[PDB]
Design a protein around this ligand. Structure first.
Ligand SMILES: *[C@@H]1O[C@H](CO)[C@@H](O)[C@H](O)[C@H]1NC(C)=O
Ligand SMILES: *[C@@H]1O[C@H](CO)[C@@H](O)[C@H](O)[C@H]1NC(C)=O
Ligand SMILES: *[C@@H]1O[C@H](CO)[C@@H](O)[C@H](O)[C@H]1NC(C)=O
Ligand SMILES: *[C@@H]1O[C@H](CO)[C@@H](O)[C@H](O)[C@H]1NC(C)=O
Ligand SMILES: [Ca+2]
Ligand SMILES: [Ca+2]
Ligand code: NA
Ligand code: NA
Lengths: 365, 326, 157, 101, 263
């Protein structure tokens, strides 16, 4: 076992080429005589953090050596004004890893139409599935300007088409745009008239946090071509949680930033060459941004669209001009989200709720 | 185009640039003007700004204004004046912007006395008014006749006059939730003259019972949550033959009188979680009503609190034919 | 006959700090006032939470109103907003309203270990030296005081 | 400049933020072997907000009876800079007036 | 020993209202004793078992002894078999055997390909991925595998050697189910309506059965009682032929009816 007090980094190492495997982890206070500090901070001996195991598994597991700084940079504060510590129980096992689910499918070669569920009452809205939790649950949020405040949950695909909901969540704030996403039983959304991302745990039905996306344009300032307060778009891929937005520093161009789903902080920022208002929507795969350029209802002397014309890699920090044909049967493309578990796109296009199939390249480099 | 402000195509981006006034160089082709998150005071508005006819949408939220601005673009339709310190509304200001349809005045310090008599009536084309999160004590008198949505929620409104909702026949959505409103505060049938009203909400208030004499001609949605509703009179829900969605959850209700929902024929959903329902003989009609109900109507929230013998049990199903009650 | 104006604040709310789970209340004073309410973290505080005291000060002619609101540890630790738990004061008059200072309630703490301890130096008779000191992490910011041989030094001396 | 000076224990002291404004200051060590550059420090000078002079009282809107008079006070003397603290207090002033008829 | 096929489930006893919204309770059917084993469910904190001398002491809240378990427990699948506690260890597809007399762990078995830790639990979740059952046939393990595509997989476990003595794959999805119980080697799948699901109005009934001896399944419609909405755990006791149901904060006992429709 390993133990380290607040702001003190912890070290984990297995002999030879053996891999670290976390069994039990807690960030808080269970015992008062282990660490040494002020007695006022030691009065509360009942501090707990369940997400501690999830954080350690994402960094230490399937690796020979590990170094995690036990502070606010890696762990969110559960109880304020209390000197915390990190208790970790780990075992040394062979260097074997689990394939397909976490692993990158490659570079996108072509998008094709897959499923057509139904034609919703709203022109614009957003639908998705939680890729972390192994469940057939569908999350639905039809966008209504200055009135979006509810997230609908469906038990299965059959219930979603038939319109049989399981439960409806009453959100603490109004939602702006069709950019919402669900990451490990928690809802991430853009709060109305703010550059803030709100974390809402579906299990507890309470808000867990609110993060400020620095210099980000909000409330119809820099949305997608259709507007509708699409200023901030959230994405989920193989690399983790992402924030697709725009800053005035980049002159309205798309700015992509990786967000930590627990600490709710920016873990890197990238500036692109593509203008957000010129873009119809965007999605992340393996840390690569894909810009959708589509045609819309009411387009004076216009036919140019229905394509992926720009790509931006985060690891390489380099951009390229592509021409991947994108399906647009109905003109008003509202939302495009990628699910790494099924490798399909979750699209909302002019009242229509559609799923798109993907084809990938033999290599990614 | 201005030097300090960077215009992009048919848009002007003067947002978050520490500006205290509107820049001079504004083109005559612009449709949307962004001036939000600046330090623009009500004194920094040039007369030439009014002359730019092409502008239809102006964003001025999160600024440092005191009064409604003067010399705003003549042919404006949508205006965003929120998250600032607006305290005075003048007739002359709203008289300039005649074509104004959508007006948002959220999080400002707007008081009843601060607004001029019939200042909102000057904006003849106004349909959407958002007086949300202000310092209001009552609903203003001189409101636009052709208004469709009045959002005057999250204030300190304790009293509502009968004349406050005069000539507002065209109104469809009325949101008065999160206020110090009681049943003594609401005038004898103030809402009755709003035939076209479709949605009504007084959630998080202090109502001892639902407001009497409500319009039923077009009403579909009625929301009465977090109030102190002790009982619902029989006459209160009759003549609402068009209603589909009703919510009375988070109230102080113990029992209901038989046939209180007999006229709500179009009812699709009824919500009654968290309520101190005392399950005696007064709930016998409730269980029977829940059995013969169609799939069209969803009634949820009916759970017993008294006595300890039937505590926490759902009113949906009875045991041993409600003991020795019938 | 009495002069009518907007409400003027006398005792504006000052930044509070919770120590050993002891709930500390916020003070508010204005004149002329008939209604005084609190707007904590964007939204209004319930009427029941407010405790009014319409005490007329001698020094001033107009009606003075004083309202107090208790803030518990449970309120701050369960608040998961973007900024520090803040509160504002709104006062009502026959002419209008007036807002006060945003008083921020924080969880008071202090660490034992110093961020950077002063380092000893050898310096000539004409030479100059600077002694560096980084206090431990804590809310509010620590007040640094220098001592020459366990006795304080006066900078103005 | 008298405002900036170099110390024997390698320290850069600035008395007033007027004679030596904001910038990306970097420390560099030189030796007979070679030279080494340190991580640059982002020193930013901010201007706090200060209220401007009162305006004139406006004419009474109502001809007979209880009237109104306004006076504005903007935050421009000095105007906040580089993330300086905003002005403290109220921006508008209102008094009741009686016009003789 | 077998009483027959189940016809209907009815309300029998109401003991008390516990402080926890979830948990499980059962009696040892092998040992002829009136001892009650109580289990309150707390997320990431479940590690103690409470023993009660009689029914009267259980209602009055007078415990005999509390057992300090070696590992954290996952879900509400608690079962007692001949003076030994059988539980699912947190963040593992491993049953753990703990003898109450000696107060020491006697074994740990790995349930092959089984989904664990909120991967495939019941409708309400709460890490109820692995649920243990006791009947006329012996000890059973109700779980789910990704090989069966989240559908319920039932396996007979030996209480001594701690090994799989047979595996059966069903057609019912575990997350769609509320709880399950074994009688005469026949699985009974309970489908129910929960709290905060204000959209739901559907009837709570048993809609699926699976026989192990015949390896055949059928769609049934046996009405299941639900006074409250948060059905935590449902366990069958072959000695008294009653269900040990935990609904919401309350702790109840259900009476069972039987039919002679069995080959
Ligand atoms: C990494 O370790 C985690 C911890 O159990 C495991 O679930 C995962 O399959 C391993 N492999 C990869 C690629 O993450
Ligand atoms: C308002 O309604 C009244 C009748 O209640 C009517 O006499 C009056 O003329 C209406 N106002 C306008 C401008 O039509
Ligand atoms: C609440 O505030 C009042 C003063 O307004 C004080 O007397 C009372 O003791 C406070 N409540 C508690 C629990 O201290
Ligand atoms: C430092 O400031 C200068 C402008 O004065 C800027 O050009 C440079 O990029 C900045 N360096 C860093 C690391 O911020
Ligand atoms: Ca997207
Ligand atoms: Ca079970
Ligand atoms: Na999205
Ligand atoms: Na069990």
């Amino acid at each position: 076992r390993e133990l380290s007090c607040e702001s003190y980094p912890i070290e984990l190492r297995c002999p030879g080429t053996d891999v670290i495997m976390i069994e039990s982890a807690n960030y808080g206070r269970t015992d008062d005589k282990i660490c040494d500090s002020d007695p006022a901070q030691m009065e509360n001996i009942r501090c707990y953090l369940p997400d501690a195991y999830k954080i350690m598994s994402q960094r230490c597991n399937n690796r020979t050596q590990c170094a995690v700084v036990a502070g606010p940079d890696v762990f969110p504060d559960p109880c304020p004004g209390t000197y915390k510590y990190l208790e970790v129980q780990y075992e040394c096992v062979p260097y074997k890893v689990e394939q397909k689910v976490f692993l990158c499918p490659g570079l996108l070669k072509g998008v094709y139409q897959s499923e057509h569920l139904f034609e919703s009452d709203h022109q614009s809205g957003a639908w998705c599935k939680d890729p972390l939790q192994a469940s057939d649950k569908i999350y639905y949020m039809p966008w209504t300007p200055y009135r979006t405040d509810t997230l609908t949950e469906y038990s299965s695909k059959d219930d979603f088409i038939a319109g049989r909901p399981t439960t409806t969540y009453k959100l603490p704030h109004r939602v702006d745009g069709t950019g919402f996403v669900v990451y490990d039983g928690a809802l991430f959304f853009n709060k109305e008239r703010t550059r803030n991302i709100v974390k809402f745990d579906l299990r507890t039905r309470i808000k867990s946090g609110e993060a400020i996306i620095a210099n980000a344009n909000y409330h119809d300032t820099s949305p997608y071509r259709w507007g509708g307060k699409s200023d901030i778009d959230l994405a989920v891929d193989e690399n983790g949680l992402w924030v697709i937005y725009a800053t005035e520093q980049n002159n309205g161009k798309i700015v992509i930033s990786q967000l930590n789903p627990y600490t709710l902080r920016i873990e890197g920022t990238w500036d692109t060459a593509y203008d957000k208002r010129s873009a119809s929507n965007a999605f992340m795969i393996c840390g690569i941004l894909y810009v959708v350029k589509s045609v819309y209802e009411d387009d004076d002397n216009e036919a140019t669209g229905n394509k992926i014309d720009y790509i931006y890699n985060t690891d390489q920090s380099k951009d390229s001009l592509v021409d991947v044909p994108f399906p647009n049967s109905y003109q008003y493309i509202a939302a495009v989200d990628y699910n790494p578990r099924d490798n399909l796109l979750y699209v909302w296009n002019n009242y229509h709720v559609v799923k798109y199939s993907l084809d990938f390249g033999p290599l990614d480099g | 185009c201005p030097s300090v402000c960077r215009c992009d195509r048919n848009f002007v981006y003067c947002n978050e640039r520490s500006l205290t006034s509107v820049p001079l160089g504004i083109p005559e082709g612009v449709t949307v003007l962004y001036l939000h998150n600046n330090q623009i005071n009500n004194a920094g508005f040039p007369a030439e700004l009014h002359n730019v006819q092409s502008v239809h949408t102006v964003y001025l939220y999160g600024n440092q204004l005191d009064e409604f601005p003067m010399n705003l673009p003549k042919n404006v339709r949508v205006l965003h004046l929120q998250e600032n310190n607006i305290q005075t509304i003048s007739r002359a200001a709203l008289a300039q912007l005649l074509k104004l349809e959508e007006l948002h005045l959220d999080d400002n310090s707007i008081s009843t006395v601060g607004v001029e008599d019939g200042a909102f009536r000057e904006a003849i084309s106004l349909k959407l008014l958002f007086l949300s999160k202000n310092h209001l004590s009552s609903v203003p008198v001189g409101l636009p006749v052709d208004l469709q949505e009045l959002r005057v929620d999250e204030n300190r409104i304790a009293v509502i006059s009968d004349m406050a909702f005069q000539n507002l026949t065209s109104l469809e959505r009325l949101i008065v939730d999160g206020n110090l409103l009681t049943n003594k505060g609401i005038a004898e049938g103030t809402f009755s003259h709003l035939t076209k009203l479709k949605e009504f909400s007084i959630v998080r208030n202090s109502l001892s019972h639902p407001p009497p004499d409500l319009p039923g001609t077009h009403l579909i949605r009625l929301y009465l949550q977090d109030n102190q509703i002790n009982h619902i009179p029989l006459t209160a829900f009759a003549n609402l033959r068009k209603l589909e969605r009703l919510d009375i959850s988070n109230n102080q209700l113990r029992m209901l009188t038989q046939g209180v929902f007999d006229h709500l024929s179009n009812l699709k959903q009824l919500t009654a979680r968290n309520n101190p329902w005392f399950c005696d003989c007064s709930i016998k009609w409730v269980t029977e009503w829940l059995k013969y109900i169609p799939s069209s109507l969803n009634v949820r929230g009916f759970m017993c609190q008294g006595p300890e013998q039937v505590r926490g049990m759902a009113v949906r199903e009875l045991n041993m034919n409600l003991l020795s009650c019938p | 006959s009495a002069p009518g104006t907007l409400p003027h604040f006398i005792e504006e709310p000052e930044d509070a700090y919770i120590i050993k789970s002891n709930p500390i209340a916020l003070r508010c004073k204005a004149r002329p006032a008939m209604q005084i309410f609190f707007k904590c973290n964007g939204e209004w505080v319930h009427q029941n939470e407010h405790v009014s005291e319409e005490s007329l000060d001698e020094s001033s002619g107009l009606k003075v109103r004083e309202v107090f609101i208790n803030v518990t540890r449970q309120q701050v630790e369960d608040f998961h907003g973007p900024e520090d738990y803040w509160c504002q004061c709104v006062a009502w008059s026959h002419l209008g309203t007036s807002k006060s200072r945003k008083a921020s309630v924080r969880i008071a703490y202090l660490r034992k270990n110093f961020e950077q301890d002063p380092q000893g130096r050898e310096v000539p008779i004409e030479g100059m030296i600077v002694l560096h000191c980084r206090p431990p992490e804590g809310v509010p910011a620590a007040e640094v005081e220098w001592l020459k041989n366990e006795e304080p030094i006066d900078s103005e001396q | 400049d008298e405002n900036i000076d170099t110390r024997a224990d390698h320290n850069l002291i600035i008395r007033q933020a007027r004679l030596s404004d904001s910038g990306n200051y970097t420390c560099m060590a030189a030796n007979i072997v070679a030279k080494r550059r340190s991580l640059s420090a982002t020193v930013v000078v901010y201007v706090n907000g200060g209220w401007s002079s009162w305006t004139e009282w406006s004419a009474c809107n109502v001809r007979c009876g209880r009237g109104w008079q306004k006076r504005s006070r903007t935050c421009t003397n000095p105007a906040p800079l580089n993330g300086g603290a905003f002005c403290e207090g109220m921006s508008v002033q209102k008094i009741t007036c009686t016009a003789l008829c």
